[PDB]
């Protein structure tokens, strides 16, 4: 199984992937919200980062993600992941297992400046936020 550093919000474990962080969104009611936070901290990376969502993914991750802010995430918070991490060689991958939608990217090498980004998994009335922080060396 490929190891995905990220958040699995579905009820099923993938036959292909294992996720570092998991919260079944079917286990919470409509008044609930999920916050799932991942922190990568290495001098150089060789990591698969991604999301397993049984609903809709906002925005078009991981081609585009949200830049985090002390305000409610809005269309003008959409950025290109390329520009957010500021490395040119990001490979993107997508998969589907039932109504679970899997989006991934691969990051290899160092990051010039510590950065974070958010992607949303919306299942009907419930929402789950995945926020990844990636450290620069030091």
């Amino acid at each position: 199984k490929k190891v995905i550093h990220g958040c699995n919000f579905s009820s099923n474990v993938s036959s292909k992937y294992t996720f570092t962080d998991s919260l079944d969104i079917s286990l919470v009611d409509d008044s609930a919200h999920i916050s799932c936070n991942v922190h990568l901290s290495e001098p150089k990376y060789n990591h698969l980062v991604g999301l397993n969502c049984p609903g809709d993914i906002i925005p078009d991750c991981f081609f585009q993600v949200y830049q985090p802010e002390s305000e409610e995430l809005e269309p003008s918070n959409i950025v290109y992941l390329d520009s957010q991490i500021n490395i040119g060689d990001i490979e993107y991958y997508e998969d589907a297992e039932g109504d679970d939608k899997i989006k991934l990217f691969l990051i290899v090498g160092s990051v010039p400046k510590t950065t974070s980004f958010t992607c949303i998994c919306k299942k009907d009335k419930k929402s789950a936020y995945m926020t990844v922080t990636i450290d620069s060396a030091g």
Partner: antibody
Amino acid sequence: QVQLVQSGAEVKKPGASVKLSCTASGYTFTNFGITWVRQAPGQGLEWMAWISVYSGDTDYAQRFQGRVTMTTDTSTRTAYMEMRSLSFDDTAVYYCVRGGRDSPILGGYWGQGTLVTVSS
Amino acid sequence: EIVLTQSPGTLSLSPGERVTLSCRASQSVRSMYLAWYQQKPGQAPRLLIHGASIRATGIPDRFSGSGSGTDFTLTISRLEREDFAVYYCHQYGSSPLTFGGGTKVESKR
């Protein structure tokens, strides 16, 4: 509280230029773009232009390419849109909206609008 | 260019009735990058929905958005008098950015 405040109404002669301003507060100006939308009297919304305060990249609707230009002053958190060679169908309200940092997007952070009236 | 067609141009109903507005695109909107705006005369547009179904901040429950591909819908479950306005759909998945022509929601008598 994100907020965009636009300059006052303008009356301009045909052929003249106008410089519209849009002053931001409540967020880091240099982390986002500014998107311009125009509304002719009684008409719908039309995307006009976009500028990234972060990188200086721009995009213009083909109708306004070359005739409209943009720039900012980051120390005063003000974005500008300049329109050259105004004609009578440039009479409209021009809105600035907080935009995406990397590509033309807009959202729900709108200025109050600037009316430009082209008249002889 | 993604042309957005809103039909009909005018809808007429009374407070308490359900509103359903339509927005059809000439081709699928990428990743549900669709927004809905409300505008009253003399005011800037107000964002109601983005991402097709995400209610914007400070917008009451009675507004909801749905749809995907070429067909999107803004629903007002029980219209209130302050909801009479023009409503625009908007896509930001493909450049150039485009808007629908608007639907006027109007008081019926």
